[PDB]
Amino acid sequence: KSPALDAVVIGAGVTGIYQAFLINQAGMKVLGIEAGEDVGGTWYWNRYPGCRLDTESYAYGYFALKGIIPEWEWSENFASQPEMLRYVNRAADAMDVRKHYRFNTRVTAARYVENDRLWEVTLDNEEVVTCRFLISATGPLSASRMPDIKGIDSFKGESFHSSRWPTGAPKGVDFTGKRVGVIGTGATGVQIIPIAAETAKELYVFQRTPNWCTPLGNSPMSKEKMDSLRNRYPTILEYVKSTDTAFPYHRDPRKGTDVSESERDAFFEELYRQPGYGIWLSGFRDLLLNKESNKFLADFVAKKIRQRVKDPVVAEKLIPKDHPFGAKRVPMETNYYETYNRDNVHLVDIREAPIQEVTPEGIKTADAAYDLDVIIYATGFDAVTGSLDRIDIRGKDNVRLIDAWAEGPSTYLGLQARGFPNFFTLVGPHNGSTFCNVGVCGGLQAEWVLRMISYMKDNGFTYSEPTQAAENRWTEEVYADFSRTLLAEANAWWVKTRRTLVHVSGGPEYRKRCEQVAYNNYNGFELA
Numbered sequence: 001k002s003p004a005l006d007a008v009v010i011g012a013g014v015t016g017i018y019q020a021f022l023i024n025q026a027g028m029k030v031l032g033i034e035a036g037e038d039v040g041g042t043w044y045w046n047r048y049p050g051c052r053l054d055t056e057s058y059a060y061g062y063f064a065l066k067g068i069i070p071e072w073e074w075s076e077n078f079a080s081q082p083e084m085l086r087y088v089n090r091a092a093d094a095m096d097v098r099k100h101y102r103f104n105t106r107v108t109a110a111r112y113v114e115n116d117r118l119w120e121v122t123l124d125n126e127e128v129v130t131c132r133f134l135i136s137a138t139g140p141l142s143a144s145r146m147p148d149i150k151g152i153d154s155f156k157g158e159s160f161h162s163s164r165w166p167t168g169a170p171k172g173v174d175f176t177g178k179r180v181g182v183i184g185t186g187a188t189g190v191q192i193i194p195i196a197a198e199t200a201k202e203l204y205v206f207q208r209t210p211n212w213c214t215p216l217g218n219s220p221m222s223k224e225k226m227d228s229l230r231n232r233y234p235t236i237l238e239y240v241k242s243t244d245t246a247f248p249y250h251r252d253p254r255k256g257t258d259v260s261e262s263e264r265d266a267f268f269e270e271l272y273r274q275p276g277y278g279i280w281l282s283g284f285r286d287l288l289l290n291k292e293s294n295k296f297l298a299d300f301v302a303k304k305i306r307q308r309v310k311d312p313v314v315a316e317k318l319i320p321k322d323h324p325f326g327a328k329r330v331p332m333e334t335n336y337y338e339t340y341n342r343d344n345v346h347l348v349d350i351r352e353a354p355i356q357e358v359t360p361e362g363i364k365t366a367d368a369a370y371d372l373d374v375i376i377y378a379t380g381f382d383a384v385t386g387s388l389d390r391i392d393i394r395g396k397d398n399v400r401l402i403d404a405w406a407e408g409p410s411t412y413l414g415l416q417a418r419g420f421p422n423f424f425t426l427v428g429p430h431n432g433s434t435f436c437n438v439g440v441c442g443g444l445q446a447e448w449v450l451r452m453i454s455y456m457k458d459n460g461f462t463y464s465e466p467t468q469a470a471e472n473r474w475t476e477e478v479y480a481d482f483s484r485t486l487l488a489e490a491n492a493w494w495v496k497t498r499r500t501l502v503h504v505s506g507g508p509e510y511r512k513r514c515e516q517v518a519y520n521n522y523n524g525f526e527l528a
Ligand SMILES: Cc1cc2nc3c(=O)[nH]c(=O)nc-3n(C[C@H](O)[C@H](O)[C@H](O)COP(=O)(O)OP(=O)(O)OC[C@H]3O[C@@H](n4cnc5c(N)ncnc54)[C@H](O)[C@@H]3O)c2cc1C
Pocket: 010, 011, 012, 013, 014, 015, 016, 033, 034, 035, 036, 040, 041, 042, 043, 044, 046, 051, 052, 053, 054, 055, 060, 105, 106, 107, 108, 137, 138, 139, 140, 141, 142, 387, 391, 427, 436, 437, 438, 439, 442
């Protein structure tokens, strides 16, 4: 039998739509599936207050850089959520990609049929579509997780996870008169807290673990600046392609030690005050390899925190003692620390006083009871493998991807897994495009995968699968490379339990390997 489609593409985020656009451009037969109503992925689903980019607007905007929508105008340096979703909507316009997709449709199971080298894809547990290739663009921080606390449903006020804010108008942003509780202090939390506190009656922050945070330094984007940028897109494109993360920054050649304390102190101050992630991704070459170098930056930020926070007890509570700087994603913020100087904001430490349960009134903890009219769960995601974990995926010998990855992910190039022929996990585990400015990183990964499906059509090949030795060596390489950094000393979302779900070596290096595989007739894959 013959599968109907060349490929199915799961997801309508920035990765998914481009993937889908490209495939169809090459004249193949594609269907996209999105669970929500329309394109946007991250930018569709995450409508909470203060939701904002990390990455410079113009560096994230692959779609603009590649002249798909060259005339696009950014209004700020770090675009808000609504602006992003506008961009994606426009981008999809010029691609004409919507007609290729099934919206309001969820993939629930996927089964490989050895005997026909195809994939049988189940939509909302009834209908079945057949494709030669399954391509997941279901993204690294899709798949929300509620924390493991007793009695979440026992709560009688308003309550929800950050990625399912009530609504397409973000309803009830105004917390006038309300007692609000916020669980979690990651990137989401840090964006939410200063904003809610403008209107909340009382704001209690339930912080189990403190992150290192630094000033976003957002500012609006003059039309001149935007003209000066669009004129350089070719340069900006090449440049972001050459940096380890595809963010527009690169390391100082020097070590932390080749420089006297007073020279370091000056260099850090200059970064601290620079808009964006310069502090994190333009430090010294050994910020993430060398405990001593890390300590230097960590003490500087510490000191900064005690400047911005008036009461020294609160301030100490907010300074991490337990993981080196830049080991977890560094959340960037507007006026976060100053928030704690407010009379109507309370930091509740829930490591020393672990949350007992959620009651109808408020939140019980080992020490106190909090009456609350609203609770916010900024508790993050089932990272990387999470949304795949939520599809029954089955391969050769009817094995599940979940059992397959039970000891941790195993893939070649982070693109295919052994036992799962003709299946591409885009920006998935052990992938060089996951620790990235994903806007550019996944654009490039979508393009490479196109070139592999194209190589397959031309040579009439119907089957692709990693060899054992390919996959073992790769995985080995990924753990090896990761154990060398201070990223090993931490529990970020990209760690599972202590192992990595992700590839930390450099994008340009990762892509260089990929090019070396593709050139050598996809060496490491069995093809037939
Ligand atoms: C709040 C937030 C802010 C971020 N900010 C940045 C940033 O500034 N810079 C950066 O580089 N990265 C950022 N990221 C990381 C982000 O994941 C990437 O930037 C990018 O959005 C990933 O896009 P994607 O299209 O690959 O996945 P997504 O954007 O998540 O899109 C995946 C889509 O797949 C759909 N889907 C999943 N499962 C199914 C199912 N089985 N059936 C049907 N559809 C399904 C989902 O509905 C979703 O729409 C951020 C992430 C979050 C959560």
